[PDB]
Amino acid sequence: HMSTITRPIIELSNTIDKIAEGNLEAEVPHQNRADEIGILAKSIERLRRSLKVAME
Amino acid sequence: TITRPIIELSNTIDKIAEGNLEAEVPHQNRADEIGILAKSIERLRRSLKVAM
Numbered sequence: 820h821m822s823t824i825t826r827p828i829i830e831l832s833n834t835i836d837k838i839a840e841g842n843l844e845a846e847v848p849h850q851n852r853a854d855e856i857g858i859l860a861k862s863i864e865r866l867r868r869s870l871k872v873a874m875e
Numbered sequence: 876t877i878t879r880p881i882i883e884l885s886n887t888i889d890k891i892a893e894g895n896l897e898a899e900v901p902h903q904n905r906a907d908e909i910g911i912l913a914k915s916i917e918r919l920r921r922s923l924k925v926a927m
């Protein structure tokens with residue numbers, strides 16, 4: 820549980836902070852996971868791209 | 876208590892990505908890793924909203 824769920828939730832939280840802190844090229848890990856971590860990662864990547872477009 | 880809130884937070888991120896910055900972010904006061912993710916989503920939301 821700590822390695823399969825806790826670790827990637829912490830990593831993806833950090834990714835969100837990087838994005839919020841203006842780094843709109845932040846790496847977003849785990850987009851190819853088939854479980855709920857993948858749903859979250861794919862959601863974050865769509866966010867990242869949406870914010871890059873909105874930066875103009 | 877892990878799967879459900881992770882999907883719920885993902886949906887909140889999708890609302891934010893689509894321009895709905897009034898999305899209510901659940902689970903901000905949880906003490907585990909879901910609380911960590913919820914706080915980070917709420918900070919991003921607030922920064923987007925204030926900027927716009």
Ligand SMILES: [Zn+2]
Pocket residue numbers: 826827830848849
């Ligand atoms: Zn990882």
Ligand SMILES: [Zn+2]
Pocket residue numbers: 879880883901902
């Ligand atoms: Zn919930």
